[PDB]
Amino acid sequence: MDVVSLDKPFMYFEEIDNELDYEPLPYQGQLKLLLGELFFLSKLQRHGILDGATVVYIGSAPGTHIRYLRDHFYNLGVIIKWMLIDGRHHDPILNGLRDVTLVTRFVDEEYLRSIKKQLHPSKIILISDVRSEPSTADLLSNYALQNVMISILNPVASSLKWRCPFPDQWIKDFYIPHGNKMLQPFAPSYSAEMRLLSIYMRLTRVTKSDAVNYEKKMYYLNKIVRNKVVINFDYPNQEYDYFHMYFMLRTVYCNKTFPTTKAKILFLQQSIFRFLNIP
Ligand SMILES: Nc1ncnc2c1c(I)cn2[C@@H]1O[C@H](CSCC[C@H](N)C(=O)O)[C@@H](O)[C@H]1O
């Protein structure tokens, strides 16, 4: 790989500072979700709004990584209830947890109102990973449903699956919430997916020119940036994705104390990799 010297990685989409013309690990998907959700929920913990909340995770199955998320905050003493809702069955590793409610159901507008009624007036934190390759109509239907989740559940914060439809497959302008577009390390090599993180809802219009901007910015990120070795980085692995993961994991809280920040991140990465069975 090519070498580079960086003070920090790109954390949000807006920070990508170049574009490029697009051209055609074990269980890496669970690692991608676990890191982004650790990042999101740790930010909410820093703002002091996580304690006492109920996390409503829609599109959670199988959700093997969710067991690590729940165990992490449970051992920190943070009082969290989990509600995992998906039409498919969840990973059996999520069984036998009193603070984790497993729901086998595809959500619609009617069911969203019923769960809001039963959880009201407790704080709701929404995590959505719903999907269906998907067509642009599928994405528009998925993103419409995510808007319905927010307008009905009225969460204090939300993390939404966000991949803009490709410009050559455009159908119609649509609206998404305002928020920060978190970038995902260990995503597929040329994925353009991000997580929309919002702390509360004003809607924002997405156009075909935005789709072009997304496509070129994310290709430059995947083709150029993520194939760099950060030579100044003090870490056993200097590849950019590990550099990126390192900066996400340093916002994570820990019960154990460490002599250095590097020792803390190294412990966290080892803990995550072992649970996900990554060498
Ligand atoms: N309306 C809905 N209500 C409920 N779940 C819905 C929908 C719709 I539309 C789609 N999904 C679900 O989203 C998942 C996408 S991959 C998750 C991956 C998961 N986050 C993991 O950790 O492995 C599938 O499991 C699918 O069943």
Burial of residue 38, with CB atoms counted within 10 A of its CB: 0-12 exposed, 13-18 middle, 19 or more buried: buried
| Nearest alpha carbon, ligand 1 atom 21 | 63
d(CA 55, CA 279): 30
For the chain, after which residues does the C atom lie more than 2.5 Å from the next written residue's N, i.e. where is it broken?
24, 132, 200
From residue 14, give the alpha-carbon distance in Å to each of 11, 161, 182, 194. 9, 17, 9, 12
Q: This structure's resolution (angstroms)?
A: 2.1
Q: Is the CB of 146 under 6 A from ligand 1?
A: no
Hunting for tokens 């809001």 — which residue is that? Answer: 116
- Crossing angle between the packed helical segments 136-153 and 109-119, to the nearest 10 degrees: 30
Supply the residues annotated as catalytic.
161
CB atoms within 10 A of CB 207: 14
Hey, what's the torsion of the CAs at 206, 210, 212, 215, to 10 degrees? -90
* Pair of tokens at residue 79: 């009082």
CB atoms within 10 A of CB 54: 18
Give me the residues paired with residue 83 across strands.
56, 101
Q: Which atom of ligand 1 is nearest the CA belonging to 64?
A: 22
Query: For residues 83 and 103, is the Cβ–Cβ distance under 8 A?
Result: yes
Question: 91: helix, coil or strand?
Answer: coil
| Nearest alpha carbon, ligand 1 atom 12 | 59
Question: Taking Cα atoms as reference points, which of 185, 180, 169, 182 lies closest to residue 22?
Answer: 169
Give me the residues paired with residue 128 across strands.
58, 160
Q: Is the CB of 88 under 6 A from ligand 1?
A: yes
Question: How many domains in the chain?
Answer: 1
Give me the residues paired with residue 161 across strands.
195
Task: Tell me which H or E stretch contains 165.
Answer: none
Report the alpha-carbon angle 131-133-134, nearest 5.
45
Residue 189 gets which letter from DSSP? T
Query: For residues 54 and 79, is the Cβ–Cβ distance under 8 A?
Result: no
| Nearest alpha carbon, ligand 1 atom 2 | 106
Which are the contacts of 212, defined by CB distance < 8 A and separation ≥ 6? 167
Distance in Å, CA 89 to ligand 1 centroid: 10
Q: Domain limits at 223?
A: 1-279
Q: Is the CB of 211 under 6 A from ligand 1?
A: no
d(CA 54, CA 38): 15
CB atoms within 10 A of CB 255: 8
Alpha helices in 86-176 (DSSP H): 109-119, 136-153
Give me the residues paired with residue 176 across strands.
204
d(CA 105, CA 200): 27
Task: Tell me which H or E stretch contains 35.
Answer: helix 28-46
Sheet holding 194-199, edge to edge: 100-104, 81-86, 54-58, 124-128, 157-162, 194-199, 180-182
- Crossing angle between the packed helical segments 66-75 and 261-275, to the nearest 10 degrees: 140
Q: How many residues does the chain have?
A: 279
